[PDB]
Specification:
Belongs to the glycosyl hydrolase 10 (cellulase F) family. The chain is an alpha/beta fold. It has helices at about 35-40, 55, 65-75, 110-130, 160-165, 165-180, 195-210, 230-240, 260-280, 320-324, and strands at about 20-25, 45, 80-85, 100, 105, 140-145, 185-190, 215-220, 225, 245-255, 285-290. The strands form two sheets. An eight-stranded parallel β-barrel has the order 1-2-3-6-7-8-10-11, surrounded by four helices. A two-stranded antiparallel sheet has the order 4-5. The structure holds a molecule of 2 linked components (XYP-XYP).
């Protein structure tokens, strides 16, 4: 059961940015304590999985929006904004996209994969616009997700193999044509470490924006660890922000590296407090901070872990009190 009278987390950040959370459609019932935590603490929602490509078009032309729409309906009922995650990724994308349908042993061509990408993006955005209209809570989408490799080169996914390097710009062109009201993000992890991947993200967005690609923001997943360096996160935000794009912290959680001891929870609280002081100091660039999961027991990280502000019994952790 949850603590009903402690401060609503997002309210602490009302003069800075919305505070959101990634959710599962099965955790939205009024009587479910995970749903109660969700509605109490967050004013922004993201689908952890229900808006991924496999979750929306499992076989070609067969769109499955029920779970996504359940999350959208809940966001509307709770006066929450949403982020759309995600139109393109190398995981949770059905194999049919990349196969020649007359010979599935062969790859789809560049033109066929681009047409499929355009149809998927346009159908997904037109679905939310036609079903929800002005009540659509989605303010923007992760148009492409994790397109860089660990060394900063373009990840050699099937999108890159079949189409080539301009598949990224094409995804943004298709999204922008389908719904110009959406803010369009490129989203990625490890770009907060101020290493070669941060520099490659800055170089890629600088290039594409100079070419007129409609990229409005960079999503910094921020799957950080208890050993992450705040100075490096601050230098990465400053570098990426110099491109004149919005920054959103999209999938925040903290990998404890197997140490869930009380001492580690106190170290986590100090690090989360430093991180949120940094986000508040960079409020001129940051337009949303979203946590990747409601509470530790539903985190995607393998066990043992304690990555979030609410523990495995849904109680506020030292980190929650340090930030509020
Ligand atoms: O439920 C799990 C999700 O939490 C997980 O979400 C991904 C985490 O890695 C990030 O790079 C991705 O952007 C994000 O979608 O996906 C796997 C799923 O089983």
């Amino acid at each position: 059961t949850i603590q009903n009278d402690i401060p609503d987390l997002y309210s602490v950040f009302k003069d800075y940015f919305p505070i959101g959370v990634a959710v599962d459609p099965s955790r939205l019932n009024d009587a479910d304590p995970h749903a109660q935590l969700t509605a109490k603490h967050f004013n922004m929602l993201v689908a952890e999985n229900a808006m991924k490509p496999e979750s929306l078009q499992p076989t070609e032309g067969n769109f499955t929006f029920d779970n996504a729409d359940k999350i959208v309906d809940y966001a509307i009922a709770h006066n929450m904004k949403m982020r759309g995650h995600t139109l393109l990724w190398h995981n949770q994308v059905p194999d049919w996209f990349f196969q020649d349908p007359s010979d599935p042993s062969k790859p789809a061509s560049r033109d066929l994969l681009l047409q499929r990408l355009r149809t998927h993006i346009t159908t997904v955005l037109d679905h939310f616009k036609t079903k929800y209209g002005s009540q659509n809570p989605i303010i923007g989408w992760d148009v492409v997700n994790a397109v860089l490799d660990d060394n900063g080169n373009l990840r050699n996914s099937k999108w890159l193999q079949i189409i080539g390097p301009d598949y990224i710009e094409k995804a943004f062109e298709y999204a922008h044509e389908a719904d110009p009201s959406m803010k369009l993000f490129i989203n990625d992890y490890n770009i907060e470490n101020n290493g070669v991947k941060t520099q490659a993200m800055y170089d890629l967005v600088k290039k594409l924006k100079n070419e007129g690609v409609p990229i409005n923001g960079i999503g910094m997943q921020m799957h950080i660890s208890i050993n992450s360096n705040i100075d490096n996160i601050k230098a990465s935000i400053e570098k990426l922000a110099s491109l004149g794009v919005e920054i959103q912290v999209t999938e925040l959680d903290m990998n404890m590296n197997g140490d869930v001891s009380n001492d580690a929870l106190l170290k986590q609280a100090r690090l989360y407090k430093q991180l949120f002081d940094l986000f508040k100091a960079e409020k001129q660039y940051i337009t949303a901070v979203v946590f990747w999961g409601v509470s530790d027991d539903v985190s995607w990280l393998s066990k043992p872990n304690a990555p979030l502000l609410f523990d495995s019994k849904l109680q506020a952790k030292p980190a929650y009190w340090a930030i509020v």
